[PDB]
DNA sequence: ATCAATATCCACCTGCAGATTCTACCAAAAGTGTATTTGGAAACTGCTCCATCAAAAGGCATGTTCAGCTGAATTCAGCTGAACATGCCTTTTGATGGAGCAGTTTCCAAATACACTTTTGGTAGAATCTGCAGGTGGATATTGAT
DNA sequence: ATCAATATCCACCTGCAGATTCTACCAAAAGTGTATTTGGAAACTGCTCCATCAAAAGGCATGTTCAGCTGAATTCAGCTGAACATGCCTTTTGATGGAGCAGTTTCCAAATACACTTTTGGTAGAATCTGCAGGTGGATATTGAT
């Protein structure tokens, strides 16, 4: 019967709503579906990151996604890189050395 | 005997460290500095180890990026060596000044 | 204490940042910068600590501070 | 003494897109910070939108416009699709 | 339909500091933008502070911390003074 | 009789209006203390005063009686703290005159 | 009405030069004017894209100065003097 | 005589001049046209408060002027005096724009 | 580009422990079901304000010429910063405590939200008041050629 | 050094667009006396934080040697700035129609607000495991030198 099930999402529509009722100022309300919509958004973007990161880990012969993988997935992707100007702790940087700095 | 030409070990270190994710500042000196800086804002403070680690991560991320922009400024100037005027230019364009 | 932030460690940071050759004056410069950074962040953090009437700077204090400095960090509570 | 986290749901989504792949605690941490960040961004923009237009309810329309505003195109297209799909399916049953 | 402003009060304060000096409409416009801006920021930081400390109410204590973040150095010291002072004056009925 | 809360606080800025704007921001789902409006009105007033002080001076320096956006810009860019606090764009403010040494004739 | 095309070239070389002059620039390479146009288009696109998104959200056909002010705030290019 | 200012003297006059003034530097009508053209390629049948066009021009000119200041710094840093696309790119990159 | 040697890096495979993933019972949200409350959508429409048109005039953009000096290329040597092996201290680690103190309760006064009835203060205009934009003309530079 | 050529001032002048000031009610402020909470205030648990300690092993600080980078000096092709002729198109003044905001109403569909009944996610305990970090030994890379 859960709204997450009804919406066909893994993410918690109910919790998302309970969190949204703390953003509507005073005298503020939240649509029945805003919770569903946001839940969907969060789930989708989580899926996108998790996919790219799992790829980075398969291409690295490991089973567990680490933060390095998360970093490689984010920075390796134009859109994710654009959206996530956070700092992934323990992700390091992407290897890159400038042309003019190499020998001969 | 045997000796590497200047620049070679450098490039080797660049490869190595760009490969790893480890903190490059030693933990205790850093903690010590954090504590001393903080002492001047509120006295007898304690720190979650997570807070010191957050600080150190934030720092090293910051200094690494800043070094990237700095290196770019040195390359603008047809150099290969970064100088304080490079860090200065970088920080200005960033609006940190 | 700031001098405790050693030349070879700053070398390491530069290296990860793709730097091949380092001027002698870079280390003092880097220290100054790192000090301003830590000052700006800790000040804010501790302000959150004191507002929460605590004697203990929490990681969340640092995370909130970092977020205010537009230096958002992932992995410690947000 | 409870402390809610998106860990469970992240893990679930992981198992859908990569049933073979696991996740470290630090990584799971990043994922949390990610979800919280984006949630706060969306929520913020949505409340702002409703304000600008002198509304009091945050509807899915605020959520959607906010998504257009926050997410770079393509991520935004797909996010809009997912959102509308979730909502239709939810409104049918 | 009346739409509010800060012009009346900017103007008062103006006459207080430089009683000889006028302000052009565009300047007043900037001033209004300035005030609504800093108001926004203070309110925002305050609501966040309240959130972080499981508190449902925003008090002078919130505003004061908000002002300590936000405002640099001397501005902050003087602002705190003026606020604290206005508040103690206001309480002593 | 009725004393306004602004008067009660010794302020030119509107404590009531500001309290209303804080109720409507807001919390969310929460409440605003009696003093928060006062403390806010006081900060906003103080800063309007700091700005108007510096601007007014600039207006004097240019032998004019009436503050324009240019003046506001001179005052804000001229002061380290206002300049830090205010990274807005001031429509009609122009820039502060500044040429680099290297550009100047040898 | 009438087809709109190449209006970026409306941003004349002398106007760009003036802008660099306020920007404190003494000497200007011939390749600046096209670069600048490039940059201006991107800037404008982004702001307008957001502004219109606000317009559309409000079910309006007219882009208001408020739409641009919100747009600008989003881009972190906050503007004083139109916000009211 | 005839009479010529040496190359760079007028340029400096213009820096002083425009640094002194505050009026918009791009001609108003062409700018409007650019705005309408860009908007149109996003949503047809749009209208603009004149106010909105002006807000945009203010924002844009402020933007270009600051950008040129940064660019001018990169030129100087390169021990030059002529700004080049190189510089604008260096500035925008460091500004974290591109 | 080879002939050597010194070191670096790279794959394959290995074995345990620090981290996982997996399992198992109690509070605190999430869903149901009923009864108001209310926001803001649908519908007339008053009425700013936007697009368009017209037309005249000079402020500017455009294009060309011509040569000054700037960027870019080259060469070069002083000296800075890298590589390195040498010698030692400070960071790192890891069980112990002790204890400071974040977090959790369990509780009444202070403090906030209400909900109605007056009592102003601010706002949208009319209506007076004046800065100053913008046009002068000579005093004082400021430049650049002999 | 000069003067000659222009540009830059700086101050005086004055009616006009733009302020500052005078005027009428609606919305919003203040004063009431109900109602509800909330957060602070104490008194105590447990986590997790500081502080020694007592060391191996790192990792840093040191002085040598010199390779190679930076910067200084010097040339020059030609890009870009200054000036000029020419005339387009932006600017400025004004009016027109009508699109479209935006100010009002009336009021279903959707939201809140209870009060219950279940359900699930957080916790702190168990049962595997991924892969770190360490082995070869095998090519690669780098640097001196046919």
Residue numbers in the entry:
A (entry chain G): 17 to 120
B (entry chain A): 38 to 134
C (entry chain B): 25 to 102
D (entry chain H), E (entry chain D): 32 to 124
F (entry chain C): 15 to 120
G (entry chain F): 19 to 102
H (entry chain E): 37 to 134
Paste lines from the article:
In the nucleosome, two of each of the histones H2A, H2B, H3 and H4 form the histone octamer and about 145–147 base pairs of DNA are wrapped around it. In the present study, we determined the crystal structures of human nucleosomes containing H2A.Z.1 and H2A.Z.2, and discovered a structural polymorphism in the L1 loop regions.
Human H2A.Z.1 and H2A.Z.2 differ by only three amino acids. The structural polymorphism and distinct dynamics of H2A.Z.1 and H2A.Z.2 may be caused by the amino-acid difference at position 38, which is serine in H2A.Z.1 and threonine in H2A.Z.2. The H2A.Z.1 Ser38 and H2A.Z.2 Thr38 residues sit at the C-­terminal edge of the α1 helix, which is located just before the L1 loop. Therefore, this amino-acid difference may directly affect the neighbouring L1 loop structure. The structures of the L1 loop regions were found to clearly differ between H2A.Z.1 and H2A.Z.2, although their amino-acid sequences in this region are identical. In the present study, we found that the H2A.Z.1 and H2A.Z.2 L1 loop regions are quite flexible. The structures of the H2A.Z.1 and H2A.Z.2 L1 loops may bend to avoid a steric clash with the canonical H2A L1 loop in heterotypic nucleosomes. The present study revealed that in nucleosomes within living cells H2A.Z.1 is more rapidly exchanged than H2A.Z.2. However, in vitro there is no obvious difference in the stabilities of the reconstituted H2A.Z.1 and H2A.Z.2 nucleosomes, as revealed by a salt-resistance assay. In mice, H2A.Z.1 gene knockout causes lethality, although the H2A.Z.2 gene is still present, indicating that H2A.Z.1 plays unique roles.
